[PDB]
Design an enzyme around this catalytic site. Structure first.
Site, short mmCIF file in Angstrom:
data_model
loop_
_atom_site.label_atom_id
_atom_site.label_comp_id
_atom_site.label_asym_id
_atom_site.label_seq_id
_atom_site.Cartn_x
_atom_site.Cartn_y
_atom_site.Cartn_z
N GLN A 226 3.59 -6.78 0.36
CA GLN A 226 3.34 -7.53 1.59
C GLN A 226 4.51 -8.46 1.89
OE1 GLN A 226 0.63 -6.98 -0.59
NE2 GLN A 226 -0.05 -5.45 0.91
N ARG B 251 -8.04 1.06 -5.31
CA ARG B 251 -7.18 0.16 -4.58
C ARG B 251 -7.38 -1.26 -5.09
NH1 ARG B 251 -2.62 -1.59 -2.74
NH2 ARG B 251 -2.96 -3.42 -1.39
N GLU C 298 0.81 -1.23 0.00
CA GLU C 298 0.00 0.00 0.00
C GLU C 298 0.84 1.28 0.00
OE1 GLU C 298 -3.40 -0.23 2.93
OE2 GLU C 298 -3.11 -2.39 2.84
N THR D 7 0.34 2.83 -8.30
CA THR D 7 -0.18 4.14 -8.71
C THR D 7 0.84 4.89 -9.58
OG1 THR D 7 -1.38 4.28 -6.60
CG2 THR D 7 -1.23 6.29 -7.91
N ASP E 87 6.72 -3.91 -11.44
CA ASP E 87 5.88 -3.61 -10.30
C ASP E 87 5.68 -4.89 -9.52
OD1 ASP E 87 4.23 -2.29 -8.52
OD2 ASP E 87 2.44 -2.52 -9.76
N1 LIG Z 1 -3.99 10.53 -1.50
C1 LIG Z 1 -3.01 9.73 -1.99
N2 LIG Z 1 -3.31 8.43 -2.24
C2 LIG Z 1 -2.38 7.58 -2.72
C3 LIG Z 1 -1.03 8.08 -2.99
N3 LIG Z 1 -0.32 7.05 -3.47
C4 LIG Z 1 -1.15 5.97 -3.49
N4 LIG Z 1 -2.39 6.30 -3.05
C5 LIG Z 1 -3.55 5.39 -2.91
O1 LIG Z 1 -3.21 4.42 -1.92
C6 LIG Z 1 -3.71 3.13 -2.31
C7 LIG Z 1 -2.57 2.13 -2.46
O2 LIG Z 1 -1.79 2.44 -3.62
P1 LIG Z 1 -1.07 1.26 -4.44
O3 LIG Z 1 -0.24 1.85 -5.57
O4 LIG Z 1 -2.10 0.27 -4.95
O5 LIG Z 1 -0.12 0.56 -3.35
P2 LIG Z 1 0.96 -0.59 -3.71
O6 LIG Z 1 0.53 -1.84 -3.00
O7 LIG Z 1 2.33 -0.15 -3.22
O8 LIG Z 1 1.04 -0.79 -5.21
C8 LIG Z 1 -4.48 3.31 -3.60
O9 LIG Z 1 -5.89 3.41 -3.32
C9 LIG Z 1 -3.94 4.62 -4.16
O10 LIG Z 1 -4.93 5.29 -4.95
C10 LIG Z 1 -0.77 9.50 -2.70
O11 LIG Z 1 0.37 9.99 -2.91
N5 LIG Z 1 -1.78 10.24 -2.23
F1 ALF Z 2 -0.96 -3.66 -3.81
AL1 ALF Z 2 0.65 -3.61 -3.03
F2 ALF Z 2 2.28 -3.61 -2.31
F3 ALF Z 2 -0.07 -3.76 -1.41
F4 ALF Z 2 1.38 -3.46 -4.65
MG LIG Z 3 0.61 -2.47 -5.92
#
Ligand SMILES: Nc1nc2c(ncn2[C@@H]2O[C@H](COP(=O)(O)OP(=O)(O)O)[C@@H](O)[C@H]2O)c(=O)[nH]1
Ligand code: ALF
Ligand SMILES: [Mg+2]
Lengths: 316, 122
Positions: A173, A147, A12, A17, A169
């Protein structure tokens, strides 16, 4: 020449994103159809978000503003089971609206750090009237806000300033990190993501672990890992916007009990930056290119990446 | 293949998993994204869903999919892992199966539909 970009970070943090922003910035965006496909995700995100809040109320001992919401709260789960993709009925919309305006529910929302609430909950929930329309097509921001949990490893290809960007990407977790070794060979740059706003939250996979510390321990692991010696370690201190909002309300001392500074954006953000940057051991040899980003803001990501690229161009 | 049969999978996820050749195409894709433990776990959950065999199969599944740092450790949250760990019964993995099902449907499955491997078949 070719560039192997690796997006890393705890769950997360914002990896996926940033990957969407590469599509927006370097591949003429999302089509209307592509957006329509996210309608189901936006509803799911919205519905789960309000459900999360409701579920928490019992556990946290919080009561509804009006006793009449109990009906709506139960009605939420009934209609969550029926009202399925890709339509939110007027009845469900009204239930979610009422619940969201309720003061007990809002109280609980304000204590979201005590459970697991999607970052985009209030973004969607505060915009319910628009999204609940039957004729609703999600906007790019809506898409960027969605998400969907990344599992495994997903590879993207794009081009920018005459460079063939191979982007990877991964899932963040604990369970996923075994898999990371599958794309460590030949890495040009790693963009490590840290959700600034996670300083008072705890890991979904282990509710005894503070998220920010998990991110710190992970970065330390990567940063000083001897196989990324000839590898650009870019640090995205992400979610600056949510962080700017959080720091006025939730004290950073939850994360760092020793922190004597103020709860203002620039001082807190500066402190966190140090906590990560200090974990670098080859300080004499290795440079960390830190940026404060908002992954969901296209203008920001475009600016920061443009910068990131120039680093790589000079450093190769 | 067909593509009558093939085309049908993009309408709903149950079609893909229901068909023999389609399930194989998807497992192939998940293997290419290193997320194959999901389809395996679900496939295990269906064979799961005797009590001495229910007891038996449960432990094998736990070590493979749920224990910390397990070889095929699936990506569920801690609230789900524990209730899984505490609770040799038929409906045991229901919640975990549903989470993994959603994980594949929301993330992997769309990308599978856009791959040339499916775009050709269709
Ligand atoms: N407000 C805000 N939301 C964000 C930001 N970066 C990510 N999000 C939100 O946080 C959630 C997790 O992002 P995601 O890229 O899926 O996390 P990942 O598991 O690292 O790939 C999503 O609902 C995104 O829209 C940010 O800089 N600002
Ligand atoms: F959706 Al993730 F790390 F929690 F890419
Ligand atoms: Mg992700």
């Amino acid at each position: 020449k070719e560039v192997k970009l690796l997006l890393l970070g705890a769950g997360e943090s914002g990896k996926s994103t940033i990957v969407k922003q590469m599509k927006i910035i370097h591949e003429d965006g999302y089509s209307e159809d592509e957006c329509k496909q996210y309608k189901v995700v936006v509803y799911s995100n919205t519905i789960q978000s309000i459900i999360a809040i409701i579920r928490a109320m019992g556990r946290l001992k919080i009561d509804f503003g009006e006793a009449a919401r109990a009906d709506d709260a139960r009605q939420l789960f009934v209609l969550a089971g029926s009202a399925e993709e890709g339509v939110m009925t007027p009845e469900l919309a009204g239930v979610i609206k009422r619940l969201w305006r309720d003061g007990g529910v809002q109280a609980c929302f304000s204590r979201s750090r005590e459970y697991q609430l999607n970052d985009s909950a209030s973004y969607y929930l505060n915009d319910l009237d628009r999204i609940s329309q039957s004729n609703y097509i999600p906007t790019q921001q809506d898409v960027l806000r969605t998400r969907v949990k990344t599992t495994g490893i997903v590879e993207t290809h794009f081009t920018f300033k005459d460079l063939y960007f191979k982007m990877f990407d991964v899932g963040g977790q604990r369970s996923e990190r075994k898999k990371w070794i599958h794309c460590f060979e030949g890495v040009t740059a790693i963009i490590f993501c840290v959700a600034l706003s996670d300083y008072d939250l705890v890991l979904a996979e282990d509710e005894e672990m503070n998220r920010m510390h998990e991110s710190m321990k992970l970065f330390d692991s990567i940063c000083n890992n001897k196989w990324f010696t000839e590898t650009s370690i870019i640090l995205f201190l992400n979610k600056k916007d949510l962080f700017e909002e959080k720091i006025k309300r939730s004290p950073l001392t939850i994360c760092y009990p020793e922190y004597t500074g103020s709860n203002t954006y620039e001082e807190a953000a500066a402190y966190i930056q140090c906590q990560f940057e200090d974990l670098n051991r080859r300080k004499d040899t290795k440079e960390i290119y830190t940026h404060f980003t908002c992954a969901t803001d296209t203008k920001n990501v475009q600016f920061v990446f443009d910068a990131v690229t120039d680093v790589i161009i000079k450093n190769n | 293949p067909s593509p009558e049969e093939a085309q049908l999978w993009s309408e709903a996820f149950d079609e893909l998993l229901a068909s023999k050749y389609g399930l194989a195409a998807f497992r192939a894709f998940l293997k290419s994204e290193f997320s194959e433990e999901n389809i395996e776990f679900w496939l295990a959950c269906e064979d799961f869903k005797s009590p001495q065999k229910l007891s038996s199969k449960a432990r094998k599944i736990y070590t493979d999919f749920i224990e910390k740092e397990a070889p095929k450790e699936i990506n569920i949250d801690f609230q789900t892992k524990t209730l899984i760990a505490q609770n040799a019964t038929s409906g045991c993995f229901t919640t975990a199966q549903k989470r993994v099902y959603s994980l594949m449907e929301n993330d992997s499955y769309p990308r599978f539909l856009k791959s040339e491997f499916y775009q050709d078949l269709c």
